[PDB]
Design a protein around this nucleic acid. Structure first.
Ligand SMILES: [Mg+2]
Ligand SMILES: [Mg+2]
Ligand SMILES: [Mg+2]
Ligand SMILES: [Mg+2]
Ligand SMILES: [Mg+2]
Ligand SMILES: [Mg+2]
Ligand SMILES: [Mg+2]
Ligand SMILES: [Mg+2]
Ligand SMILES: [Mg+2]
Ligand SMILES: [Mg+2]
Ligand SMILES: [Mg+2]
Ligand SMILES: [Mg+2]
Lengths: 124, 128, 225, 109, 216, 51
RNA sequence: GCCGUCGCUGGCAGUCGGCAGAGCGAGAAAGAGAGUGGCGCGGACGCUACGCCGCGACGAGUAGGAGGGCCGCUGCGGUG
RNA sequence: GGGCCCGGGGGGCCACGCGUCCCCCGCGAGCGCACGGGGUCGGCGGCGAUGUCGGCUACCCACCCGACCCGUCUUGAAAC
């Protein structure tokens, strides 16, 4: 299930990394990038991920569907938002809040999308 | 315009000097690393007045300002560009640090990616 | 609908508020009755002393039921029986004070530890400084400061001791549940005496501070606290 | 156009017979040798003025070689007009038996 | 609807009323005062009418926010503090300014300002001291007083009048105010014998003179 | 909770004891009335010394 | 004030959000319980539950015992 | 003196309503002030790009106090 494989992943996963009295996870779907149960995305049926796009502009949002859990190719669906700063975060908030799709991670996804926008903004 | 931390508390330290080993001044074979003396008639181990201090648990720093740089950041050793997407989110609290064995052509990419991600590097001019 | 629900919540909040106001009125009137009792007890001893001198006799006052004991000497080099009596009187560090009621057992328990303690018969204002300034209760076996009367009333409400004035009245006018009030009171962690001491080792009679000092303990309670 | 500081000689530190507590300094202000007379200087600001090799900045003027360690007169000491002071940086023992300046402008008059 | 009335009972002790609560009830006469029982703006756009939003959601969020702090109860700003006074510092006295660049000068005190600083002004011919603010602690107060109560101080000058703007040229308003205050001070201090020389001369400590010993 | 001293602090003493409000409201009025009676007795003594 | 130990086997799965109503510090064995007759889509952190947080007391040490080491050296199976 | 200082013919009060019977002689609302569940200022002043600011720790030196060379067997070691 969820906790059953969390008790396996929690110490001996390949994405896990430990140095400088810190612990992280280098997963592509992990948001806030630290080792935690609520933030781990490969375990849960409902998974939100916020990534930069293949191009320089735009932010892609990764949504794990509930049907193909054991099918890794058709598990995740990617959508690109190449929009302005306010309505991009509003679109992600309307994705996570109003669809009843894992509401515990909406604010972390908004923070990560703001970080990717600050990254893709041109440097001073 | 350096990268400021989120909160900057007063980093108080109870002791800044090194706990040097007993009789490290006399002999060259004795290193400065602390080893607890466990003799029967030694002066340091039973806490005589005016002797070398011992590393007790009372000298521990506060948990808010432990492992903290004087800038206000916490160190994290980074080998390549892929380990900066780990620290793009935890930006205002923790900082990055490039390893010694990393070549300059990859240090340039690490510094450029950290400048994009607004992450402070403790050694931004490591090779040049 | 949430029509009757919010109104009933406001009614329950108003009920708790008026219940709290009634308990405050009870605490106020208990403190006023206690002030009247202290006035009566202070004047009746002077009255008994005046009528005996008017008749030509002598008034022997009643022996005071309550004493305050301060462990004035340290822990090093202590007899085991003496150390047992000190830990049964809850005197563990130096300069700790406890209220002890008097009987034939208590007099000999203080007599067996006379050279290590200073015990006397305290005043009402001395009890007031000891309870208000150093008020520490043992709630869930923890030394918690008595900043509110609810902390006293949660532990000793079944013994009709619901406020600081109830506790002071019990300790000064020792009654039934002095054992529960004193066991609620943590041993008073008092400071060093300001100015100095006469002598720690010898008895109060032979030029020191140890032993019994009946009326003179009020000079030393205010000196330490 | 004159002296605006009282003469005080730094005797030593707060010390026992075989221990010293160098964070508290013992100060001997000239002219006052009584506990009833040392109540005036309680709370005044005091400083050991010394000059060094390298130049340091000076507020309200050109940089000079003089340096100070500011402080605060805490409470009296003894019975013969000695007094205490707590400084921010501890005094060197080079200044044993030398002049420091106790001031008047932390006034209570 | 009702006019505001002041406090009935006087300040007997700080935090303690002079009357008890039932006498206060009888004074309030509450026996006969008993009782029983935005963000959206529509704007036409030349389409239809658009509904704009005020205080909309932010476009940028930082990486981490700090939590809110606890509510302290007795921590006032500097404008709302109480402003203390000494018994020696009265309007009319002659002060000794020490810590400023005007060291040891005996300068006449005028009045207490709003922020808490001392408005101190000597004659420009005598002290060479302007309309200057001094701190209360940083001043020796000498008991030498003049009858200053019959003057007309300007009301336009205040703490904001003497606050530093940002070379500093002397404006004409400072000169007019200095002349208007000097014309009120100067005959009252020249009526006192040998006072202008005391104002011109500087204070200085010397050998065998100690402030705990002398009185003033 | 920071233990504020009821002997020093007024409102902590009021929270632990409401009757301390009336105990401290009294012996201000009483002491001022006794001081005014002392001033009246001193004035009567000075009037007796004058007359 | 700070560090560690012990105890309360204390608290936290309640992040229950137009599928909503934001609490269980309060002296008093037990329910902010169901019924039936007379415009604006909005709300910081969290929780490696081997983790996080709050209360109190405690802190010497030879021989000796136990626990924690994201202290250190060498080699192997995985992993970066 | 104690009994709400039993009862009858100038000062303080944690006492505020209406109707019925017997005996004795549970929601009223609004605005501030603050000795109230641990500090704030909605207060400021100076010095600065060719000589100055900060660097607790680490390089050297000066001063005060402390201060006998480690392991060992030993009741006891700085031990002649
Ligand atoms: Mg030995
Ligand atoms: Mg002994
Ligand atoms: Mg003393
Ligand atoms: Mg000089
Ligand atoms: Mg201890
Ligand atoms: Mg130990
Ligand atoms: Mg010496
Ligand atoms: Mg041997
Ligand atoms: Mg042998
Ligand atoms: Mg032998
Ligand atoms: Mg030896
Ligand atoms: Mg020998």
């Amino acid at each position: 299930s969820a906790h059953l494989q969390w008790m396996v992943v929690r110490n001996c996963s390949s994405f896990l990394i430990k140095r400088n009295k810190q612990t992280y996870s280098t997963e592509p779907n992990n948001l806030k990038a630290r080792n935690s149960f609520r933030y781990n995305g490969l375990i849960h049926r409902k998974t939100v991920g916020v990534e930069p796009a293949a191009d320089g502009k735009g932010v892609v949002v990764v949504m794990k569907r509930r049907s193909g859990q054991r099918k890794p190719a058709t598990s995740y669906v990617r959508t690109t938002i190449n929009k302005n700063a306010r309505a991009t975060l509003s679109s992600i908030r309307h994705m996570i809040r109003k669809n009843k799709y894992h509401p515990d991670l909406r604010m972390a996804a908004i923070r990560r999308a703001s970080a990717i926008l600050r990254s893709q903004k041109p440097v001073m | 315009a350096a990268l400021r931390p989120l909160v900057k508390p007063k980093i108080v330290k109870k002791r800044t000097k090194k706990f040097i080993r007993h009789q490290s001044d006399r002999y060259v074979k004795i290193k400065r690393n602390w080893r607890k003396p466990r003799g029967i008639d030694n002066r340091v181990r039973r806490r005589f007045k005016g002797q070398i201090l011992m590393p007790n648990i009372g000298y521990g720093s506060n948990k808010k300002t432990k492992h903290m740089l004087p800038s206000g950041f916490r160190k994290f050793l980074v080998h390549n560009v892929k380990e900066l997407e780990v620290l793009l989110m935890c930006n205002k609290s923790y900082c990055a640090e490039i390893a010694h064995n990393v070549s300059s052509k990859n240090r340039k990419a690490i510094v450029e990616r950290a400048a994009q991600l607004a992450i402070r590097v403790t050694n931004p001019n490591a090779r040049l | 609908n949430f029509a009757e629900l919010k109104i009933k919540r406001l009614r329950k909040k108003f009920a708790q508020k008026m219940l709290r106001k009634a308990r405050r009125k009870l605490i106020y009137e208990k403190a006023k009755h206690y002030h009247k009792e202290y006035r009566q007890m202070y004047r009746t001893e002077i009255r008994m002393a005046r009528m005996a001198r008017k008749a030509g006799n002598f008034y022997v006052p009643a022996e005071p039921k309550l004493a305050f004991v301060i462990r004035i000497r340290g822990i090093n080099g202590v007899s085991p029986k003496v150390r047992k009596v000190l830990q049964l009187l809850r005197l563990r560090q130096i300069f700790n004070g406890t209220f002890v009621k008097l009987n034939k057992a208590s007099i000999n328990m203080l007599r067996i530890v006379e050279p290590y303690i200073a015990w006397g018969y305290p005043n009402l204002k001395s009890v007031n400084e000891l309870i208000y300034k150093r008020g520490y209760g043992k709630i869930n076996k923890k030394r918690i400061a008595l900043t509110d009367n609810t902390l006293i009333a949660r532990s000793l409400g079944k013994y009709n001791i619901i406020c600081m004035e109830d506790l002071i009245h019990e300790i000064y006018t020792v009654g039934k549940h002095f054992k529960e009030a004193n066991n609620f009171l943590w041993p008073f962690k008092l400071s060093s005496p300001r100015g100095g001491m006469k002598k720690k080792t010898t008895h109060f009679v032979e030029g020191g501070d140890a032993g019994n000092r009946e009326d003179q303990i009020n000079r030393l309670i205010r000196r330490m606290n | 156009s004159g002296r605006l500081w009282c003469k005080a000689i730094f005797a030593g530190y707060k010390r026992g017979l075989r221990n010293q507590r160098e964070h508290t300094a013992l100060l001997k202000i000239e002219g006052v040798y009584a506990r009833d007379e040392t109540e005036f200087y309680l709370g005044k600001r005091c400083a050991y003025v010394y000059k060094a090799k390298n130049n340091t900045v000076t507020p309200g003027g050109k940089p000079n070689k003089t340096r100070v360690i500011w402080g605060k007169v805490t409470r009296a000491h003894g019975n013969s007009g000695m007094v205490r002071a707590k400084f921010r940086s501890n005094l060197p023992a080079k200044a044993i038996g030398h002049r420091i300046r106790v001031m008047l402008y932390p006034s209570r008059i | 609807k009702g006019k505001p009335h002041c406090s009935r009972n006087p300040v007997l002790v700080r935090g303690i009323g002079r009357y008890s609560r039932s006498a206060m009830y009888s004074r309030k006469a509450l026996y006969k005062r008993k009782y029983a029982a935005l963000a959206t703006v529509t704007k036409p756009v030349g389409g239809g009418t658009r509904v704009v939003k005020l205080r909309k959601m932010p476009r940028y969020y930082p990486t981490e926010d700090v939590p809110r702090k606890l509510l302290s109860h007795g921590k006032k700003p500097f404008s709302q503090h109480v402003r203390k006074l000494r018994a020696s510092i009265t309007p009319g006295t002659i002060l000794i300014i020490l810590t400023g660049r005007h060291r040891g000068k005996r300068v006449v005190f005028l009045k207490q300002l709003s922020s808490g600083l001392l408005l101190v002004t000597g004659p420009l011919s005598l002290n060479r001291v302007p309309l200057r603010r001094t701190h209360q602690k940083f001043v020796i107060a000498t008991s030498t007083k003049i009858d200053i109560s019959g003057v007309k101080i300007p009301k336009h000058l205040t703490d904001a009048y003497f606050k530093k703007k940002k070379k500093y040229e002397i404006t004409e308003q400072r000169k007019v105010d200095q002349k208007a205050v000097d014309s009120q001070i100067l005959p009252k201090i020249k009526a006192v014998p040998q006072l202008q020389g005391y104002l011109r001369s500087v204070f200085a400590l010397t050998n065998g003179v100690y402030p705990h010993k002398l009185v003033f | 909770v920071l233990k504020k001293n009821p002997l020093k602090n007024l409102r902590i003493m009021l929270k632990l004891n409401p009757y301390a409000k009336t105990m401290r409201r009294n012996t201000i009025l009483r002491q001022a009335r006794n001081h005014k009676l002392r001033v009246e007795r001193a004035a009567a003594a000075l009037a007796a010394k004058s007359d």
